[PDB]
């Protein structure tokens, strides 16, 4: 079990598994019971997030692709960038987080190296 770890979503603990059988490596969260599911495409994931063993809180997150071809402010008068859609997850182990954090990155660079 390398590219797959039990990740939490919406307060529920499911199963995070990277679909490396398709063109663009994806990330599919399949609940433990099978009542909750979620899909994530690393192709859009601009950045990755993971709480190292140094962090008492074990939780992972992925930054999705936004759009820097519009630009705007925060309604106050500060030119900022549209918040990128990210998927926040929660892990319950030190090794589990490493399984995804170390595996996801494998897909991350998969786009940078090519791009």
């Amino acid at each position: 079990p390398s590219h797959s770890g039990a990740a939490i979503f919406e307060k529920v603990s499911g199963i995070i598994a990277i679909n490396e059988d398709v063109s663009p490596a994806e990330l599919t969260w399949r609940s433990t019971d099978g009542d909750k599911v979620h899909t994530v495409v690393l192709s859009t994931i601009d950045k990755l997030q993971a709480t190292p063993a140094s962090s008492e809180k074990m939780m992972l997150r992925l930054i999705g692709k936004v759009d820097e071809s519009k630009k705007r402010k925060d309604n106050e008068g500060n030119e900022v960038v549209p918040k990128p859609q990210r998927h926040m997850f929660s892990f319950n182990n030190r090794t589990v987080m490493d399984n995804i954090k170390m595996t996801l990155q494998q897909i991350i660079s998969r786009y940078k190296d090519a791009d």
Partner: peptide
């Protein structure tokens, strides 16, 4: 300040 309870990872291009 969500960095104290979360670390950063290799992000896309910037500079």
């Amino acid at each position: 300040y969500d960095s104290e309870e979360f670390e950063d990872v290799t992000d896309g291009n910037e500079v």
